Design a protein around this ligand. Sequence first.
Ligand code: HEM
Ligand SMILES: CCc1ccc(C(=O)O)cc1
Length: 394
Amino acid sequence: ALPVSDADPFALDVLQDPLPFQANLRDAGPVVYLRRYDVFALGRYEQVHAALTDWQSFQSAAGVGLSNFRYETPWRPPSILLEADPPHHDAPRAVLSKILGPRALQKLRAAWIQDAEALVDQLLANTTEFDAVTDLAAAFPLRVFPDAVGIPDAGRENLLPYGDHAFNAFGPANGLVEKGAPRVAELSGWVNAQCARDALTGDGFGAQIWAAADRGDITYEQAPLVVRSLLTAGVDTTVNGLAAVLYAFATHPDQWARLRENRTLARTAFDEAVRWESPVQTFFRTATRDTEIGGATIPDGKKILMFLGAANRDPRRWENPEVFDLGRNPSGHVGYGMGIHQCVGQHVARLESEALLTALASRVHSLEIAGPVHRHLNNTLRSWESVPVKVRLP
Ligand code: HEM
Ligand SMILES: CCc1ccc(C(=O)O)cc1
């Protein structure tokens, strides 16, 4: 009965430009069987939302990549947040929810704002033409987030590769994964080292996680894996979200002026970029029982592929979805997911954006694309390689 398709969402040509595919997915029906992978794809907002929230029907503990941990060996000990269901999910989630929550981040705001202003000021002192990825979007998270976690300086060059491999590894064992598999032992080796109590400053998120373990909120065994979650999820996502927002502003002069005309728009600017780009494209779930969704039965034990990018551009939910518009209300986009696993780092992402955008807006009159943009292909993370920009100063 279902629409059925030979489309490969992880083919390089789709990864380079996934918008065609998303439209085809959404157009085919609520539920498309991807024969290539024996999973059920969902591309419309309504079903993606329903699948995300229904953790009882659609579990995470069997893996939220293609790989089914029922049968297949994980490349790493699975995340005790992302790949855990209730009740195991609950305690580590609650720890991060508190540590990364708005109240907690309040104390970092002025420092991050300040660090962003310094970054931008020093960049613009040297040059008004530069790569928005390497000089801003990549630079700024690396300058603030590792320090805030409180890991040592040694080995920080592993953060982006580690993150990229983890997101690739949610995909099939295709070239993007298999070309990374030599390096994982040394990648996994480093990150585990950063997660130990003795490797971490006694100030940052890491120390706070360990302090939560002292109170018994989590165990000393969970504590380093909780730190690990931050070091997997917390860097590459924000780099690519920041690249997207910068790309959006550089191609939308009116939206840029609107930001400049009201600095409180940063928050909603970043959230709209998250909707519009959807840096995290896809996640899987595993059906725990035969389940009806969008008219289709998902057999017990089979995986659903949720297309967050496609749901975020679904015209059933969004007016003129292709447009980047800070006048839009993007609240309810599924770019951070939805329900019990909804991104716990969203306050962290929004603050980085607020800091960087405020700093940029203070010093840049207008912003243009200065040269060809280039994507970095990844199975699950829409990644920006280069975004040459030129700025005009006041
Ligand atoms: C633009 C930035 C970000 C995007 C687009 C993003 C996206 C996501 C999405 C889609 C999920 C849901 C996973 C699922 O449903 O299976 C998620 C979960 C998560 N994110 Fe984020 N994220 C971002 C930034 C961050 C940051 C800065 C951190 C940490 C500081 C972080 C940590 C996490 C964690 C630990 C989870 C798992 C939570 C759970 O399973 O309960 N993310 N993120
Ligand atoms: C942002 C998607 C994501 C969420 C959590 C993890 C992790 O816990 O390692 C890794 C990736």
